[PDB]
């Protein structure tokens, strides 16, 4: 998926 903090 996608990184939360980037």
């Amino acid at each position, epitope marked *: *998926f996608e990184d*939360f903090w980037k």
Partner: antibody
Amino acid sequence: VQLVQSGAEVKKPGSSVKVSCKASLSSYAISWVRQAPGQGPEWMGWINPNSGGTNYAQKFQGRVTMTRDTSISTAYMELSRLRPDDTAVYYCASGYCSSTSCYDYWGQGTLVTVSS
Amino acid sequence: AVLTQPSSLSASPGASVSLTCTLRSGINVGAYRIYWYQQKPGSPPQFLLRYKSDSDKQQGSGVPSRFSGSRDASANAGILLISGLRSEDEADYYCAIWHSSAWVFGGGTQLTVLG
């Protein structure tokens, strides 16, 4: 399910502290956020668990080190040459986002008290 | 003063409330995903939702629908909306953006629910 941090710390101004954040790791970045008493959150940086690559906020660049041990799957945050202003609850956090929703995970937090 | 929030807001249960996260002029709200968090005393901040537009929004896992994002180009302010306004909603509310290669947080809004 869970991030679990180390216990509270008390330090003298000029010393260092090392807080651990053990996953019950991720493939996503573990970010470190602190909150001074009666204040908002303050982002310190993140670490990538696979690479071990870091990205510190400019304020802490110089006196913060973030590491990981993928064997035991715990992230560490060491803050050096402590100031009274570094008195805060230090949180570790990580998560991921789809197109639909996001799944964040926070530690319980670690109170670090800095005073003479 | 990148992100600014109102310090306090009070409303009664059942009604809807809007919380603003004002961006400094030049830092256009339309270009950022505004991250919203709820924090009750003693616990870590918990993610509510992130919102850029109606076409670009992600809710928090297990966060009720009554929590919803919005924005306003003229005011240059991201908005969080709460519909149910249960007494459970009484907490501090922080906004955050990824600005100039760093995570910036707001001062926070203390939402009081009248009993």
